[PDB]
Amino acid sequence: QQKANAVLDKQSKIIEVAGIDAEGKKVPELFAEYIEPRLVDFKTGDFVEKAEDGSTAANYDQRKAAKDPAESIKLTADEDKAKILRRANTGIVYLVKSGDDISKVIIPVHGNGLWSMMYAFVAVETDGNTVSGITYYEQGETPGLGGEVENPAWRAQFVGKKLFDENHKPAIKIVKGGAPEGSEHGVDGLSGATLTGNGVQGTFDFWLGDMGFGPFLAKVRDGGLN
Ligand SMILES: [Cl-]
């Protein structure tokens, strides 16, 4: 079943955003060496060993969990900034191993675009604030417009940006028509693709908030990884 090729490209994207030099090695090999998947309780931000459905980090299906009322919540329209309708109570994150230390954490985020649900990985430094990279691993927006979330030049703009402001509130901004420079939080919007851009904005506003990875990244900031 492939199914397998889907799992493998996901692993590829994780390795890609992790900034690991692939010394010719294959993806399943690099993933075992450098990646440690962990489950996270969103509300508390704590690492957990199992989800409510009994899954471990190795077999947890967060998308399926999000539609199971036993282990997810229904978001009000106002709460639902990323326009995803529901949120699993437990998330998965991918720790990047240096040696015995954790070098980065990669968090899965998503939000609705114009034509499609848009899924991305965001690589965060162990300060729990600085973005190391971003990659969209599933989206179906129009090439040349919203599809430009896959453009290397647009994604590179996220590198060095801070996720949070001084109150640890979500601070990433999709700035219509080009952010300034020396900008702490701002990246350029997608020209001609405001609706996709709004979906990206909502993605960060929700997933950096109290119902998302907010509590977790706070614990990262306070040294919860190493
Ligand atoms: Cl979710």
Residue numbers in the entry: 36 to 261
What did the paper state?
The NqrC subunit plays a role of an electron carrier within NQR.
The crystal structure of the holoNqrC' protein with a covalently bound FMN residue was determined and refined at 1.56 Å resolution. The central feature of the holoNqrC' protein is a twisted antiparallel β-sheet formed by six β-strands: 1, 2, 5–8. The β-sheet is surrounded by α-helices from both sides (the helix A from one side and the helices G and H from the other), which fit to the grooves of the β-sheet. The electron density of Thr229 side chain unambiguously demonstrates its flavinylation. The FMN binding pocket of holoNqrC' (shown on Fig. 4) is formed by N-termini of α-helix G and 310-helix E, as well as by loops 6–7, 8-E and 10-G. The cavity is inlayed by amino acids conservative among NqrC subunits from different bacteria (shown in orange on Fig. 4a): Leu149, Trp150, Glu176, Thr177, Leu180, Gly181, Gly227, Ala228, Leu230 and Thr231. As shown in the current work, the isoalloxazine moiety of the FMN residue is buried in a hydrophobic cavity in such manner that its pyrimidine ring is squeezed between Leu149 and Leu180 while its benzene ring is extended from the protein surroundings.
